[PDB]
Design a protein around this nucleic acid. Sequence first.
RNA 1: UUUUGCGGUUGUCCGACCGGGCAGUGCCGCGAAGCUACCAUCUGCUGGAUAAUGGCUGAACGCCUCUAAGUCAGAAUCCAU
Length: 191
Amino acid sequence: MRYIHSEETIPVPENLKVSIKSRLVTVEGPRGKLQKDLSHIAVNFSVVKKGVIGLEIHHGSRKDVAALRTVRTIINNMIIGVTKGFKYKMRYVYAHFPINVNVEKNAETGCYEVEIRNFIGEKIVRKVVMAPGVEVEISKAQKDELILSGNSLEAVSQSAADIQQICKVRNKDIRKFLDGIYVSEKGNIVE
RNA sequence: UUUUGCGGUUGUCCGACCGGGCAGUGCCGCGAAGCUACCAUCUGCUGGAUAAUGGCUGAACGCCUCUAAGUCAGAAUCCAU
Ligand SMILES: [Mg+2]
Ligand SMILES: [Mg+2]
Ligand SMILES: [Mg+2]
Ligand SMILES: [Mg+2]
Ligand SMILES: [Mg+2]
Ligand SMILES: [Mg+2]
Ligand SMILES: [Mg+2]
Ligand SMILES: [Mg+2]
Ligand SMILES: [Mg+2]
């Protein structure tokens, strides 16, 4: 079965502008500007009301229609990141060896870099470089916590995933050795 | 080891000495050059794409989900240097 029409709508709040050209979505607001190339999906964009973007697929199958809500959610995520931002909080956990974390912004590039030392008591220092536009800081509110903030949820979550994956225990009972850096809270910078 | 280079030495022959011949390299010691020995010495690189897996975002399926669109990492693998 091919559905004649599949429709979805995105409301755009008053403080931001959205431009779609050749399926390249650009969202600009108070916190900055984001871009996303959606040319790999056959979707029809339009303006259905004063501040509502309609996106539809015509004569699509189940596989094609499954991407409509994905595109909506992605563009909505871009909008909320542009307006309120995204903030991930990670917690260090360990049994015996305190995990040492040092974060600094590069001079020659705008990216932040995080070095992890004393993981499970081994001498190798593991260095992970954040995606551009993502800021990392040591939490001043409470101990053993990292704060990653940014405009793009994809970049923020990918940097957090990189930090989480770089700290793994090998050839051990993972049910017993729980040491690592794990994302604890996902939210927005504002409110 | 035919450098038949030097020395020693058996038998025989050149009358003796000296210096040599022959015994298909007489035999023995040392023996440079050349060849040669994990029997000696020197030297043997890092980029990309991935598989299994671990993930991000995220529908299908108002929830979920590494997957369906997209995407990160990743093997003595594969393709290059
Ligand atoms: Mg064991
Ligand atoms: Mg000889
Ligand atoms: Mg001689
Ligand atoms: Mg003689
Ligand atoms: Mg004769
Ligand atoms: Mg003989
Ligand atoms: Mg010799
Ligand atoms: Mg998810
Ligand atoms: Mg895919």
